[PDB]
Symmetry: D2
Subunit: 117 residues, 4 copies
């Protein structure tokens, strides 16, 4: 909940994007993506509880949002396979990260809100 | 064609937004919006030929894009009455402005590309 | 708080946009913009308490965010005079509206989240 | 130049994002990313000539834009390592794709324009 949150919105319906799968990976020493955490957005479009302050160490993380399944379920054939962000976390000490994504069938926009606990 | 261009994209269909009405206004000394230029986007989502260098002086301009009519034509319920973009232009003299807009039914994004 | 909320984020700093002025207008019978409510975003980038369920009737509303003052205070000369959205509210009965804006010096993006109470 | 174009804009400076590195990969049968094409954006923020119709077959493609290096060159601390854009292309045969990206230090937006 605390250190990594994901929020997903639907720009076609003006709503949270509900029950969207989110997969988080962390780059290992051998430069491969290791599975780190995953979950589904709630009825508010939010995903909390992915990790903890102890587990969320320095690293390069990928957050991969399964936008394709979301659109397909609504009868839309979308462009992207997913929406993903890749970022270095906690380089200058622990921070809280909110990754927000705004979804359309042929477009997405993502931002990060980073705060110091 | 040169000093002020508008380009509109459709984020739902992954295409230019074609036949979108665009009106441009300039702020008058009494803070009312005076009609300045208008047009409809082409098949490429672009609208050129709005003004000339001589006519486009420093001032506050409003570009109003009729997004509601566009979505209604597609049978999609939209949130906004329109998308407008208000900016100060040609202080520091003439400049070249492209106002781009990316449209979704319940969201839009606009950016300005100001080049040479 | 309930029926109309505004949230503003800074895409340059990855932060809420704090202490941003927001002015709300409602179109009168004579097609003029009448002042409806105003406020400032908090340290979380949020503005609650603008109106109430009784006051927020059907109408065409404008939300005008003073982005120019925000950027100027940070030493940036931005493009826009403001970021504004214009929308019809409560056409099909009362709804809750969240207007979110994401700000950059030469760009902004706005979305609406509309829910049924 | 024809089937796959990339265009990158800078939302902070209101300009094309120039000299941005772009790498394109195609997903291999073993789910690894195989190098496909690359280049740097021009003075107009555009990158043409990546592939040809014959080479650009249906598959899953990744366009990876090195946004971090771009912001570092400007002395601005960025959030993302890069901006990547993953999509399935030429099922239903060849198509024309423009991948556009709008960059800020802590945000980006991408849209696809798929025309005739
Ligand atoms: C219109 O522009 C966009 C808006 C959004 C919405 C993002 C969103 O809801 C963000 C959030 O809900 C996160 C907000 C936030 C604000 C201040 C804080 O100090 C904080 O950490 C404690 C968190 C997402 C994508 C967009 O393109
Ligand atoms: C990808 O996000 C965006 C793209 C554009 C398109 C600009 C152009 O085609 O020149 C405009 C606004 C956006 O938010
Ligand atoms: C939605 O706005 C329009 C779009 C088009 C182009 C293609 C189409 O028919 O969708 C033509 C006229 C329109 O008014
Ligand atoms: C930030 O990336 C670049 C931008 C430019 C163009 C103009 C400038 O100097 O800012 C040139 C080389 C770069 O690597
Ligand atoms: Na460090
Ligand atoms: Na009604």
């Amino acid at each position: 909940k605390c250190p990594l949150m994901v929020k997903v919105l639907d720009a076609v319906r003006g709503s949270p994007a509900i029950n969207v799968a989110v997969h988080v990976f962390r780059k290992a020493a051998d430069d491969t993506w290791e599975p780190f955490a995953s979950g589904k957005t709630s009825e508010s479009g939010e995903l909390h509880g992915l990790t903890t302050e102890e587990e969320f160490v320095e690293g390069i993380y990928k957050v991969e949002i399964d936008t394709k399944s979301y659109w397909k379920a609504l009868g839309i054939s979308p462009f992207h396979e997913h929406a993903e962000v890749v970022f270095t976390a906690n380089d200058s000490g622990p921070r809280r990260y909110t990754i927000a994504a705004l979804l359309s069938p042929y477009s997405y926009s993502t931002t990060a809100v980073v705060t110091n606990p």
